């Protein structure tokens, strides 16, 4: 009956975006964030939570801290800083659900160290390693099984591509599909040329177009199983700090034209994908999609079709806020089907 | 014979230094024979060759295997251990360690290299505690062979300190304020992330970021006369390399901009040759990539008020210029060895 007690492991771009998503939506929520674990300290994480270079200054309520907790309007969030989840105080804190947002425990064995620490469930804010059920809200989350103790909410790009791929596949039947995400840079790229297991991510991020290998290509085949092995693509990290665009080229079976492709996704955006896909005919740019709550905003002006069967669609997404909105959605969904 | 050198930390400074040495190898008393870094030789040979700022390395061919980086048949043994005590310095006959991780800047920290077998350490940053600090062209001729752990100060220190020395000896510096408008560095955060310094925590390519500068204290260590008489700050801005220092000094002998410029200029052609360069061109920061001088005076920006308030503006390639000086300090140490 009561509310799900949440802890955030990793108070980074996603962990802090998610916190501010929750703080804004808290009036309607079966969740209550009661704990943070991060490499840094409560006072430092309070400062960052309030002063965000991308979201501006948080103003819905006052944000302070002491040595133990962060406070958001007198609401206390306890703060611990240990790098091994095994050692985290999830038992004493009664933690029901963990938002694994460190990028360090995407495997079931690492992700379930939170379960050794007392946590009852774990939501990985990234594509899981090994067989971990992967969900995309609006495509696949309705198959959530309350028995899953470890889930993956996917990647930002997966949450953008997947709703669109689902509408296009059912309308016209997708046979093969390529993707390229012109993606803002993220914290895993180096500020100046420095060591890295990805020689391309090793290069100065705000200075380069940086091709890397995204797994949204793989993920989409997870949440839409009949397209497993029919999609692939890459990512091009570029010098913007937030907001991405995904370009999808698909070979479909039923002939169509750009007018018809747009109309399908528009109809979806208003009914079966309302709140997940947004339809825009406006001539905007990335800055204009900061803070957008949709998973995908179709740039209707950019749709093109060749020969009836080769379809090109381009969709925007706020890789930090939009993805954090879905993380929250998925967590609420688990809170509703809790067992 | 040859002073066998190892690089600890193959970062921006460690790799700029290497490329400096490789260009000056044919005339050098040093021999770089070892590298320690968190990363492997293949990754680091790739980084040494492909550099967003310096471009592809032209002079010699660069390659690697499991054990070494090869710069034109020259083999540099690589190890990857993060505690200098476990480093094979004694086994590699290493004499001088170029400490460039930025984490072993205290005497006891840097001293771990001596236990591992090295004989002297050159810290590519200000030291923590009594560690003699040297800037080439200002005080490096005071170096003593008996000192085995030394600091080559910050990049901003190496730019400002040659100019202060000239200004001071010509006009007598009583007080001075400094602000370096400064490219961001690895120390800053790509996006808002936690950091000891709440402003260097903030997305570097998005913000003007006020922070501290080592030159505020270091200049007074290399020009002892002026200890306590200088202060200033850094503004970090969204450029990857090259910086500019703004120095406003109250001086004793009244002067004017033409005289300030003529003193620095003549110094640049005599006692500060190679250290200070005098420029009259109307240039921007991109144009000073790869300059070998520690400071390039921008004479068009010199101004003076009431004879005693002097404003000078000096460029510096904080990566390449500073690394050139590290090599100079190293060569000097290998010259006056003991």
């Amino acid at each position: 009956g009561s509310m799900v007690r949440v802890a955030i492991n990793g108070f980074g771009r996603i962990g802090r975006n998610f916190m501010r998503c929750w703080l804004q939506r808290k009036a309607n929520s079966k969740l209550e964030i009661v704990g943070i674990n991060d490499t840094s300290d409560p006072r430092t994480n309070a400062h960052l939570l309030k002063y965000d270079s991308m979201l501006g200054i948080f103003q819905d309520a006052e944000i302070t801290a002491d040595d133990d907790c962060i406070y958001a309007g007198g609401h206390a969030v306890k703060c611990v800083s240990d790098r091994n989840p095994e050692n985290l105080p999830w038992s004493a804190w009664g933690i029901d659900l963990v938002i694994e947002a460190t990028g360090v425990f995407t495997s079931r064995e690492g992700a379930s160290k939170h379960l050794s620490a007392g946590a009852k469930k774990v939501l990985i804010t990234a594509p899981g390693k090994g067989n971990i059920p992967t969900y995309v809200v609006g495509v696949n989350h309705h198959t959530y099984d309350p028995s899953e103790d470890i889930v993956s909410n996917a990647s930002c790009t997966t949450n953008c591509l997947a709703p669109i791929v689902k509408v296009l596949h059912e309308a016209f039947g997708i046979q093969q599909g390529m993707m390229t995400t012109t993606h803002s840079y993220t914290g895993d790229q180096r500020l100046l040329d420095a060591s890295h297991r990805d020689l391309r991510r090793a290069r100065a991020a705000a200075m380069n177009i940086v091709p890397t290998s995204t797994g949204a290509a793989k993920a989409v085949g997870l949440v839409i199983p009949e397209l497993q092995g029919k999609l692939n693509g890459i990512a091009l990290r570029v010098p913007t700090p937030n907001v991405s665009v995904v370009d999808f080229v698909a070979q479909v079976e039923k002939p169509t034209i750009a007018e018809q492709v747009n109309q399908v996704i528009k109809e979806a955006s208003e009914t079966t994908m309302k709140g997940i896909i947004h339809y825009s005919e406006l001539e905007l740019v990335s800055s204009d999609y900061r803070g957008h709550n949709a998973s995908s905003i179709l740039d209707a002006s950019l749709t093109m079709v060749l020969g009836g069967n080769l379809v090109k669609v381009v969709a925007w997404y706020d890789n930090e806020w939009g993805y954090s909105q879905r993380v929250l959605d998925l967590a609420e969904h688990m809170a509703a089907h809790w067992a | 014979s040859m002073v066998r050198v190892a690089i600890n930390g193959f970062g921006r400074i460690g790799r700029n230094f290497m490329r400096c040495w490789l260009q000056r190898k044919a005339n050098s008393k040093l021999e770089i024979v070892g590298i320690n870094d968190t990363s492997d030789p293949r990754t680091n040979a790739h980084l040494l060759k492909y550099d967003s700022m310096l471009g592809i390395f032209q002079d010699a061919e660069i390659t690697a295997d499991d054990d070494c980086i090869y710069a034109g048949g020259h083999a540099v043994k690589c190890v990857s251990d993060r505690n200098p005590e476990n480093l094979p310095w004694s086994a590699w006959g290493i004499d001088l360690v170029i400490e460039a991780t930025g984490v072993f800047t205290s005497r006891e920290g840097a001293s771990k290299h001596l236990s591992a077998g090295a004989k002297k350490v050159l810290i590519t940053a200000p030291g923590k505690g009594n560690i003699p600090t040297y800037v080439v062209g200002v005080n490096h001729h005071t170096y003593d062979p008996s000192e085995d752990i030394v600091s080559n100060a910050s990049c901003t220190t190496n730019c400002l300190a040659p100019i202060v020395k000239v200004l001071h000896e010509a006009f007598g510096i009583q007080q001075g304020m400094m602000t370096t408008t400064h490219s961001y560095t690895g120390d800053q955060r790509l996006l808002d992330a936690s950091h000891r310094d709440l402003r260097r925590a903030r997305a570097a390519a998005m913000n003007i970021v006020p922070t501290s500068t080592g030159a505020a204290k270091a200049v007074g260590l290399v020009i002892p006369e002026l200890q306590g008489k200088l202060n200033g700050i850094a503004l970090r801005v969204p450029t990857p390399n090259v910086s500019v220092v703004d120095f406003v000094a109250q001086v004793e002998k009244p002067t004017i901009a033409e005289q300030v410029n003529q003193v620095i200029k003549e110094a640049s052609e005599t006692t500060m040759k190679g250290i200070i360069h005098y420029s009259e061109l109307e240039l921007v920061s991109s144009d000073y990539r790869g300059h070998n001088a520690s400071s390039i005076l921008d004479a068009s920006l010199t101004m003076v008020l009431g004879g005693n308030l002097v404003k000078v503006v000096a460029w510096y390639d904080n990566e390449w210029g500073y690394s050139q000086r590290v090599l100079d300090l190293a060569e000097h140490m290998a010259a006056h060895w003991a």
Binding site: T186, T214, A216 | -
Partner: peptide, 21 residues
């Protein structure tokens, strides 16, 4: 590899971070 044995222990170092985006 030493840098491969280092990214095993500390994936949260900016020398190893991989966010499949």
């Amino acid at each position: 590899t030493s840098f491969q044995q280092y990214c095993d222990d500390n994936p949260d170092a900016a020398e190893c971070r991989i966010y499949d985006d």
